[PDB]
Curated annotation (Swiss-Prot), chains A, B:
UniProt function note: Co-chaperone which acts as a regulator of the Hsp70 chaperone machinery and may be involved in the processing of other ataxia-linked proteins.
Ranges for domain HEPN: 13-129
Tissue and organ distribution: Highly expressed in the central nervous system. Also found in skeletal muscle and at low levels in pancreas.
Record note on domains: The ubiquitin-like domain mediates interaction with the proteasome.
Phylogenetic lineage: Eukaryota, Metazoa, Chordata, Craniata, Vertebrata
The protein's name: Sacsin
Source species of the chain: Homo sapiens (Human)
Amino acid sequence: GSVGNPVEARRWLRQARANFSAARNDLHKNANEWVCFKCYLSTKLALIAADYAVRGKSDKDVKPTALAQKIEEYSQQLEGLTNDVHTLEAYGVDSLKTRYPDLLPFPQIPNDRFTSEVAMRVMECTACIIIKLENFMQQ
Amino acid sequence: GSVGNPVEARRWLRQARANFSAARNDLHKNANEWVCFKCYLSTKLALIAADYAVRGKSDKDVKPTALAQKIEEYSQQLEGLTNDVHTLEAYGVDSLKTRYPDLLPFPQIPNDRFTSEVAMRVMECTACIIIKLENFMQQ
């Protein structure tokens, strides 16, 4: 898209970074669904930040993997972004499955769903996503 | 409602209790929006649990205060529930305002929206809700 909004981009990135920092508060506390939801939301907000940075607008209705696909076309600097973002799904992480039992295979609840190993792999993916996007927004 | 599902009720309540416990992880860590969202989700899932316990079905597409209005009618034991649940909205807490900057007056982000005092009042309000619903479900 044509004209970017750097003020709004910075605002959303600030929150994305806060969400990733806060994921540390739930580590090794039997709250792995909260590590994963925080990382999912960090990822979503960082992508929306980048969308503001380029186009001055976004959509919170669009799934992160689809937002990442559009954003990745903005520059070769973002190569690999969509693969990173899609890895969250591969670990069974999305907005609804980290929160609601009716979306999980009976009888699982979110508190039962994610191992500490998975929460760690999800943090690694998220850190890489934020780094690719911060690099791109720095220019 | 006429036929309850105690197994589903227990599933949902187990997750609500886990969310309320997880809220403690974010206290005094500059993550008050996460304290509030966790308490919001705890409240919502406990209401859904009570709805399962009474009629064996619910809706997660209804706002918590609206669900509480229906549930309050189930028993004298639940007197005051609707107002108890409405406290969250009164303190500026709901699903979107604890997560998304575009819902907040510029330049505010969730990470600077909630004071530590508001975070504490929200935990106390959530305690009151959980108490009322848990006592009722121990029918």
